[PDB]
């Protein structure tokens, strides 16, 4: 209810991956004051380091960030994160649950978020987002929704892309449950993502052989995967990594249109280009 | 800083009323004792999954938070949630103490993670974390135990 | 000496690789009627198929192309080729020479070229280019110059790019020996080709115990996009078909330096239609 | 043609005199016989690597081209063949023979058959490629080359 000039957003991204959050914030025209990312895989760090010109301040393992570090590096306006899910997926029979293995990394989030929340009486806007899979144990989902004191929003990227990708999003972002918008940039069909001379067997990919090329079924190429998930073409064409490693990076990533849908209302809260 | 008042305790301990027995053993007045467990004005509230931040706010304020057992992650993380929910707000210098017990037979990953989250290195006896004057420890390289550890509490709260 | 509207060029590319010739012809603004390429490695075929939208008519092994094929597919205005060199380089001790192994592939060129030149009395313009390595046996170079009835022109990509790449070019292209022009598009230094956050040890790269680039106080080899920039190709030009970065490096190593081929093909604008 | 005229021959054969011996053994008149080897008026011209296309033009026209040995020399023979072939539209008679040993790589046999557009004649054991009538095939050496050259008596003058 008071007057001030809109200021650029200050972001803390845990488990940043290939810097989907910064890409989405840039695409929305939101000015990014600061982008401190916690990422441990060197390939993802190289992707984000190259494709954003060292704007990202990398701090490494999320377990090496202390509350004093949050206070000194802060304040932060947005705290986003997507913890590893190999120990949360019911597909994995050797899963260790939410509290063991790599699932307990979630609590790191729950830690730093509470360290980054404005102190009581501070009416400044503050937003956070935590993404994970839907195919987790019901007990794990209940526990996550208990710790975060929020019920998740189920969003499937098949509605704004050519990928079957349903995910749970906890957070306090404005209107996360609002209906998604299929715009003209959205490539809703797998055929729209293929390179020249390839045909798509299915409308939306579920990652058999999804494409036919000159009477010979193939798998999806890497640039086609970038198009499917909404990333710019050759966005992951850095650092001489194997195609399997690039596929690994792209599979753990966020669907760009989904994150754009989630971040769009932030334009009425921060400076915009 | 008013005159000494009776202590208010929140227990997620594996053995219910262990903390209450230790407190009565030291002769400390108890104004409230809320106990809970993990499963899979002195009250037992059952499953910790049923305890919310609003419940902690209503039953509170709390002065002591105890937890542990004589996977280790679930117990500690429930205890950590309750500790965060019961901790005084920044700028409230009122006394607030906590203790977490576990067995020494735990993965080094678990011990280091617990020490990191609690910002405290453990006391070896079993392993014990706490902020009571006495269990401040540098970097590492039966209820009588809790009695001796809780000894400094009678210097901060009213005794009968 | 007579009048006619200049027509688009008809090209036969043997050992085409990643379609460097078509890329250079397009960049110069020359109109391409048709582009028939003989290539056997499927990675190169996928590169050329994707990055030029299926405009290349692929015919496969050069040894499967007959004189009747050259006649029926023709006429052709430009016959270009760069045969494999692993049996011609002196760096290979197991080299089999020009006449055995993969070196004899050269003669396929010499074959099809003679099947493609206009019959005597046909005053129509007709050009051809054959590229190979400098580090080859002197006897092999003399034999190639004998069979092609032309002395080669030595061109090093270092003069017009950031790569050490000296090659022999036999051909009747107009003014092949003319001085090369260093334009503004040319990235003469390796630093100009590196991605963000990397520093170049040297000024120009060579074809061990040297990691050409420093990155954040660590030694690294050249990235694929940086190799593309070094060789003159567009960025992500070889980012197709899920091939290993080693295979991408192999494709880029065998290729022509784009600015060198542009220098060689420039005078063709005065002979064919230009968009 | 005006009449039967004496033959003109270009020999890259290993053994400079073989072609002339076989030609005189069949009684065929010879206006020109020029022999060359691989190294590395009847006349010897030395290394084939010294023979140019202009030399073939000046010494020519040629009616017969022979090469081989009872290999890198096949490509030299093929160069001389291309240089000696009649221009398009010249239906004058022109013949060639290439001999090699049957002990060759199957790759070499296939490559020679491709380049010469002809399948070879097996003679147990040597391979003979040629366009003489009777050398059409589907998929010392003096007497056999004599019997193979036999059809030359019907295209050139005999003494
Ligand atoms: N201990 C740790 N500290 C910080 N990051 C970690 C970590 N362990 C795993 N990670 C990272 O967390 C990521 C989870 S996958 C999520 C990636 C990101 N949401 C994106 O859109 O790209 C992985 O990329 C992994 O590299
Ligand atoms: N038998 C054959 N028929 C047709 N192409 C062949 C061949 N054997 C090898 N090649 C191709 O010849 C190429 C020689 S390397 C030259 C590539 C090309 N000049 C460029 O600029 O990219 C190789 O890519 C190889 O795939």
Residue numbers in the entry:
A (entry chain A): 626 to 832, 847 to 912
B (entry chain F): 628 to 667, 680 to 709, 726 to 780, 792 to 807, 894 to 912
C (entry chain B): 626 to 832, 845 to 912
D (entry chain E): 628 to 667, 680 to 709, 728 to 781, 791 to 805, 893 to 912
Task: Give passages from the manuscript.
DNA methyltransferases DNMT3A- and DNMT3B-mediated DNA methylation critically regulate epigenomic and transcriptomic patterning during development. The hotspot DNMT3A mutations at the site of Arg822 (R882) promote polymerization, leading to aberrant DNA methylation that may contribute to the pathogenesis of acute myeloid leukemia (AML). Here, we report the crystal structures of the DNMT3A methyltransferase domain, revealing a molecular basis for its oligomerization behavior distinct to DNMT3B, and the enhanced intermolecular contacts caused by the R882H or R882C mutation. The fact that the RD interface mediates both DNMT3A/DNMT3B oligomerization and their substrate bindings highlights the essential role of the RD interface in DNMT3A/DNMT3B function.
Despite numerous efforts, we were unable to obtain crystals of DNMT3AR882H or DNMT3AR882C with sufficient quality for structure determination, due to their strong polymerization behavior and low solubility in solution. In light of the fact that introducing a secondary DNMT3B-converting mutation, DNMT3A R676K, partially reduces the polymerization of DNMT3AR882H/C, we set out to prepare R882H/R676K- and R882C/R676K-mutated DNMT3A MTase domains for crystallization, which led to successful structure determination of DNMT3AR882H/R676K at 2.48 Å resolution and DNMT3AR882C/R676K at 3.2 Å resolution. The structures of DNMT3AR882H/R676K and DNMT3AR882C/R676K both reveal a tetrameric assembly similar to that of WT DNMT3A, with an RMSD of 0.29 Å and 0.33 Å over 800 and 811 aligned Cα atoms, respectively. As with WT DNMT3A, the central subunits are well defined, each containing a largely intact TRD and SAH-binding pocket, whereas the corresponding regions are disrupted in the two external subunits. Note that the introduction of the R676K mutation does not lead to an appreciable structural change for its surrounding region, except for an increased distance between site 676 and residue E820′ from the symmetry-related subunit, explaining why the R676K mutation partially reverses the polymerization behavior of DNMT3AR882H and DNMT3AR882C. First, unlike R882 in WT DNMT3A which is conformationally flexible with poor electron density, residues H882 in DNMT3AR882H/R676K and C882 in DNMT3AR882C/R676K are associated with well-defined electron density, suggesting reduced sidechain flexibility. Furthermore, unlike residue R882 in WT DNMT3A that makes no appreciable inter-molecular contacts at the RD interface, both H882 and C882 engage in notable intermolecular interactions in their respective complexes. For DNMT3AR882C/R676K, the sidechain sulfhydryl group of residue C882 forms a reciprocal pair of weak hydrogen-bonding interactions with the backbone carbonyl group of residue M880′ from the symmetry-related subunit.
